[PDB]
Amino acid sequence: GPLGSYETDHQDYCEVCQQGGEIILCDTCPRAYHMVCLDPDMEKAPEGKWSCPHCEKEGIQ
């Protein structure tokens, strides 16, 4: 499912469940996975700019 406007083009299936549907597409990364496979604690809906939880891990923090 499309998030709307994302930077990079990416798959329409979960890399975790290996199935699409209500997956979330990082607005920056070529990643695609459902919210539940990312984090059951993640409840904040992807509104427009949604960057994957992996994004913060790709930073030099």
Which strand (E) or helix (H) includes residue 38? helix 35-38
3 or 55: whose CB is closer to Zn ion? 55
3 or 37: whose CB is closer to Zn ion? 37
| Residue 13 near residue 19 (C-beta atoms within 8 A) | yes
- What whole-number distance in Å separates Cα of residue 18 and Cα of residue 36? 13
- Which residues contact Zn ion by CB under 5 A? 14, 16-17, 26, 28-29, 33-34, 37, 51-52, 55
Which strand (E) or helix (H) includes residue 25? strand 23-25
**Shortest distance (Å) from residue 14 CB to Zn ion:** 3
**Shortest distance (Å) from residue 6 CB to Zn ion:** 10
